[model samples]
Target chain A: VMQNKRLIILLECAIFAAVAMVLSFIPLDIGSSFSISLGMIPMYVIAIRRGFWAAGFAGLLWGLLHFLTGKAYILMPSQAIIEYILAFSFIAFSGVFSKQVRSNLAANQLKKAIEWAWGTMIIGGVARYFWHYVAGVLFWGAYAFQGWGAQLFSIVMNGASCLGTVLVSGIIISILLKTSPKLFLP
Target chain B: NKRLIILLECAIFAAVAMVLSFIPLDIGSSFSISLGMIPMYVIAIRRGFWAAGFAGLLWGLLHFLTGKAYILMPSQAIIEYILAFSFIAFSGVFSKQVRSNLAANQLKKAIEWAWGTMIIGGVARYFWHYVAGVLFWGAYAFQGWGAQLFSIVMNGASCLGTVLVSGIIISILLKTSPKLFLP
Candidate 1:
């Protein structure tokens, strides 16, 4: 049963990453290849249902899939590591709230858990942004200024897009959680 | 209820159109390439006629502002600015059928509305472009091509891309974002 559980988690992670890939194709196209997509929602959904490690693997795999599929152009071997590998994997931070949310719900602390989950998602999104910011500042330093505007650009573009995914996923998850919260139970 | 409907429509149409307008293949204005029309057609399909007409009208002015296309004589400018754009408003005709059909989960009928919206938008814009190309642009026809034939060919080619892209994206949008239809 334990082994089967592990296999189920791994399989779910793969399925979520593929869903993210398909969503990424429906890009908003906001000038130059700079657009937002609904790609991160499925990974975040998995994060809410499973736990940190599972979500982390999903993010890592999703990033790898994008890299493998030619969605990103790697200037050098190192660039791929920072932007593709690290930036996407960082989104798994959303899993940080899963334990808190579950524990609170177990205690019947529904309101607090809901509020805590929101804050956790915000921080998780920020953490995900932090890595992308690191990659942007480090790799894009040549084209970007070593100033506030440059950091702000990375935060809003990389970080803020996560806010949208979280909001959209929240709507669906709220309903799904009501129907079968036990799917997330250990 | 009306507010929810209004909010969804703006979120769906305005944001998509605004974002799509920014990034285009940037084909030369000599061909009047505009990515804005791709999202604008979706708007015409959902909102009333005025929604798409106004969106297209603003796009025409936006094209000039963005330096993608320049204004010529008074007649040329009028056609490009007003007539060529407002033509898309006719596409609003299919909006009611699309919304109702999709809500009823009638996928086949819903698709027919989408195709109808595309057809209406294409014909409307192409007709305007044809008229503009003939009268305003005929003063300078290419090589030895007759002015009328030149107008017909250019208008037809431009409308084709708009219809093709909208046809694909609208179907995907309908299937993917079912939440957009909720009460």
Candidate 2:
């Protein structure tokens, strides 16, 4: 029974990763080369439903799927690993508030649940994008915006990307929780 | 609820098709292969004609908005960019048969229908390009049968290339990961 339960979690994570891969293709392009993507919502959902380890593994699986499917833009091996593998794993940090979310929702504290959801999403988004910012400044210094320098360029690009992801994920997650709270039940 | 999931899945597949368009394999001066249609075929086999058609339609619209389309005239553009792509839904003619065969554990029959579906879908999509090439673009160059022949050969090769590639991938997946075919 324990083994079956563990396998089920893995299966669920793999399905979520596949879903994320499909959704990654639809990006809402904003101005200045920035786009808000809906893909990360699945990872956030997994974070809320299954907690840190499962979410991290799912995100990493998504990164590998990007590579295996020939969609990854690889410049360097280390940069690729950092950007593709570890960056997504950082989203696991959102699971830090998973217990809070589960407990609050169980108590019927809707306000607390919403607040923790937002907090978990922000923390996750920040952790994930921080690597992208670091990698960009290191490997993409030459392509930085004119006069803005590498630091500013990396910061702005990664920040806007993260902001878009967090904003979209937060709204969708909130709606799902409101409509189907049992979807997250342990 | 199921309908909504189908819509979302179709949209996701359409997005994948659009993304695949960006990395085309340029075969010659006139013929380049884009695997975008493969996803449409997958949708057709999985969810039947309407969903596949919807995905193709969305992919066409996305292609147009991306400004990658070569629009000589407005009407021709609509036919090529919109109707041509949606024609891929015709592949779903075999959807019910494929599902029935798979349900019966007839793997060979299912795979055969799947491959047939790919051929039909690929040709259906390209037929519009052929039509548009003759009706509209034929004015600039050779006319009559010459233009017709050119469109046939050009569109034919590209369609064959896509269908061939898709068949290979589909065969592998069906053999190894048959659950991918499940709706």
Candidate 3:
């Protein structure tokens, strides 16, 4: 059973990686050195489908592919390790909902399953942001001291952008999945 | 169950979202993106994905019709329109899962459900914005690769701010509202 689950996870990761690659093409530029990546669609889908480990692995592959494609500037191996690897790995937490949802389905508890899924998505989004923040602080700390008020302003502004996008996306995804539970099945 | 009621609700929300696009909440130089769809998330949970997606498509149509297609062409418009709106509808995935877990009264299961929703949803949100920012916005703003990279990073930082804010707020809301649970 464990082996079969792992195989499923691998398959899910491969599918999500393809989706991420495709999504990498769409762009929502910020200003100087940032842009919005829509790659989360596949990542979320995989996590919802398979489990957490699959999501994390997909994230890792995405980070690696991002670096390889020259989409992001890698200062050094350390930057890659901290920013891409660790940050993406945090996405695995999203899989926690998979088991819960599965159990709920097994028991025929639809309403509870819905609530848990929303909670899981929210938590997963936060974890993703948390790791990204860590990566920024660690790898891009140089920007932290650019100026006193400027630094503060940038941080707040960036936080707002991140939060806004996530909220908007999360709300939409939750609504979609709730309406079409069939999408959850293999 | 009540598909018509759900569709009406979605339509109302989508209309609101379209209007929100015009209400410029200028944080600094760039105006804040409209947040009308936040309420629509409830609709997704109450209704289903098809209704929510239709609502999102309607909002997208309104957004484009209102001359909000600044960065990309019609094709890009279609992608953003579908993806952005569909995101809310996708939230329903969690609703069913959460409802089932709560029925069993399993705390462990509940925690797991919460984890998947936030992590998967959060990552997907960022990724979507990132793609839009880079492919459409960045390409238009910058000429060379260096300029594009700089633009993407800066804009990404701003987008990150929005993600963090919404994530935190949603977290607090979910934790505080037991009634929101599906059981």
Candidate 4:
């Protein structure tokens, strides 16, 4: 059973890695300096599927892959750590709700299930948001001017993207899970 | 069960969210964050998801109609308006658990529920703004991946800061006066 679980996790990771590679090629631009890379979607999928540890490990793999593929030059090593490792690892936290959701379903605790689902999404979203926020503030602080306003602006901008992605993705994931749980589970 | 009271509360919350969006609290050159989502969250927790969802949609509509028409295109409007608002309404999904806990007089559970609602709703509100910042306002339109990623991080910070402040305020309110739980 343990081996089978590992195998399923491996399959999910492989799928996530492949998707990340493909998404890296389709870049989304937000502003002069902002954009969305669908590459994170696969990582999110894995996190929401296999649980936090597996998702985090997959994120680390993604970071390593990016470095190998020449996409790591965008930021310094520290920033890379934040963007790839920290940011990605945070998504896995969503897996915390996996057990609750399953048990709720088994027990027909719909209300409790929904509560846990919301909690998982919020906590996981905040964790992902924090990862990006710290990375931006520490590594990209230079982008914001020396003024306090610039610093504050930088913080807000980072918060918006991180929180936005997590919330949007969380909602999408919830809808998908509600509609078809098999799509996420192994 | 007077649906009119619920409808009135929904309208009031929607208007509040809209008005908050326009308050225009910009943090330098990076982003302009809003504090108006707080009331939407309060209403959602107090009333229910349907009311909060409708209120969120109305707020988004008002935002579009106002001078700051960030989500201009139809597709963008739909994504930013309906899906985004619905995300806020997601908080209402927790109404049952929270209401039950409050009824049982479980103050701890009630507090936890309130925090969950605020945090989830706040994240949803900020996420939509983030997408708008990237898809509509950022370098992604020009196919600049590096610039897009950078902006994502920058705008994300601004949204988090705003949500953090709002969370603290809501936490205080939830702790001090559980009466706010009433519609």
Candidate 5:
């Protein structure tokens, strides 16, 4: 039973990453050079369900899918690794409150569940986007406008998309948590 | 869990919309009315915007997957079929607010929000069609009218027709079964 449980957990992580891959296809496009990815939503969902390590593994798998499926934008080999692999794995930080969120929801503490889950999502998004911001500043800085520092440009652009994802993710997660608290239970 | 319930709910609505798409009430050379929007609008109002939008997206994707889409250009196809269809989900943006108003016994305000939701969704969904008509299919404009004017009239008429019919049905349903409107 223990071995079966571990196997089931691993399978769930793979499936969650694949779901993230599928969701990425329906990205929320804002303008011509920018689109907000929906992949994070599934990650956030699973992160809260499975906790940090499982979520981190799923994020890594999702990052790998982008490359394997030719969906990734590669500047350089090292940069791709940092952005696609490391940046995505960082999202697992959002799972830091996973147990708390699950326990709160199971205990029927709706307010506490929402609060902890909300903070978990924000932290995960921030940790992941922070890497993208740094990667943008370091490698994509050549495209920056004159007089506007690369750091500033990267921060603004990354921040705007990150903020967009956060709001949408927050709304969706809030509804999910509210509608069926049992879904979050371990 | 409620997650699967909502997923199945959205998929059913999307399937219904897909079936309705085949029976459009075509008007003249440009405009066409379809009751498909009714299912989409109902889902938005009932399940929230994201769920409604997901249903719309599924409906749109089904069009292509089933090889029923009339594609003119790649960008235009994406805009019209995928993005525009998903915009219908925005109709549910005020769903929570409408729910609150209804709970507070503010029927007038709830009705207003419900109507506003339909208009918001109708415009967002069709606005892309207008843009695509003007942008990619400009050559097909009627003689003596500019592309911009032609798109506005054509898409606007279709949007207005469907929105009016669906809005009436929605309002009637809302009045008769207020429980249906509750999120």
Candidate 6:
């Protein structure tokens, strides 16, 4: 009898895509190839609240928004699928730990909850960075290198970029989990 | 949706039971310990009979389907493989007490319910084993080992030993981490 449940989820997804888009504009220029942004905070919120699949689709939509809004450089069709789409969608996978974190909180185990919260963000960030590496290795190889050299470069660069966002977003989300349990402690 | 989640957890428990079966504690002679039942036992304690009944059924069917033990006598086959594991569903009987006590934060009472369920579940499992061992394997071998000391007591002890070892571990889990018993 939760009549508006689906509507609420759809509304959250749309809002998160916009939130991600707005935060992405504040990218910290670490160089042309690597930059940091707060877009993942909204994506993480969506994932933990909804679940993996929903979060994944939310990320996909955000990436799609990036493409339509001319914010992303669509070098190749596969880049759209891999780099822009799958990479962002994979961030929602952090939602997998949502239940565990909430369960720990329900039990009043703050330490365990914090531990799992960090773990969830890291998992999402790692997943996103890994796909970005895949895209870099496949597509950006022309600019960086031709062979395996590009693979290592992509991993190093993407990993560095991902670390910044993961930490920042994780800290912010952690604060939210503590202060605004209303947002995620379902 | 909650039912779906419960069913999914049940399916996972079934797979877990099968996976755990591979890690056997071989103690010489037909006395190897298997942790396969532990998943079903935990599910029974947490979600009660229906969830565990499905999981137990899956575990029992998987054992039989794997052809680990060939069935010579149809009746004993049913008793040992199917009915033996299926009886684990009985442990869910104590689930009501587990929650009431847990919600009250009565660790002592909660543990008593858990222990009681384990014993009840173990006894039910061993009952089938005793029947299968004496009737099928033993051929009423009580004639030689004497049903009182060797045939009955040994089988009973071995079954109890496995259950006791498992029960002890589960007891520790429930005691240390009560949230596992929670939703």
User: Which of the numbered candidates is closest to the native, going by highest TM-score?
Assistant: 5
Query: How close is every model to the real structure, measured as TM-score?
Result: 0.44, 0.49, 0.44, 0.45, 0.52, 0.48
Error of 4 at B137 (Å): 2.2
What are the root-mean-square deviations of the candidates from the true structure over C-alphas? 23.8, 20.3, 23.0, 20.4, 21.3, 20.5
lDDT of 4 by residue, A67-186 (tens): 677766466643564466445544556666767765664575656655666676667666655646655555566666556443475568766765655565566666655676665545
**Model 1 misplaced stretches (Cα beyond 4 Å):** A1-186, B1-19, B26-33, B181-183
Each model's lDDT comes to 0.64, 0.76, 0.55, 0.62, 0.77, 0.71
Candidate 2 chain A least-lDDT 10 residues: A26-35
Residue lDDT tens for model 2, B26-80: 7653477867876787788888865676577778878778877878876467557
Per-residue lDDT of candidate 6, residues A1-186 (tens digit): 356554467567778878998888886866655878689998888877776645655676677688777888777764555567556655655787988887887787777877888888899888777767766765676666345476787887888888888888988888887887667754
Candidate 1 C-alpha lDDT tens digits along A8-89: 7767888998898888778665543245546766776688778765675677677778867788757555456545655565
> Against the native chain B, what TM-score does each candidate's chain B reach?
0.80, 0.90, 0.63, 0.79, 0.90, 0.85
Model 4 bad stretches (over 4 Å): A1-186, B28-30, B71-74, B101-108, B140-147
lDDT (tens digit, per residue) of candidate 3 on B27-139:
64322433544444434444544444446556665666777655455423433554444444444456566556645665456445544553444344334444445445543
- For B1-183, candidate 6 gives per-residue lDDT tens digits of 654577678778888988887786766433557587688778888788545655665676677766565476754565566556655766777988987787788878887888788778777666656655654564445456743345467567676777778788777777787777777
Candidate 4 interface RMSD to the true structure: 16.1
Mind sharing the TM-score for model 3?
0.44
True-vs-predicted CA distance for residue A155, candidate 1, Å: 51
Model 1 quality (TM-score): 0.44
Computed on C-alphas against the true complex, the DockQ of each candidate is 0.01, 0.01, 0.01, 0.01, 0.01, 0.01
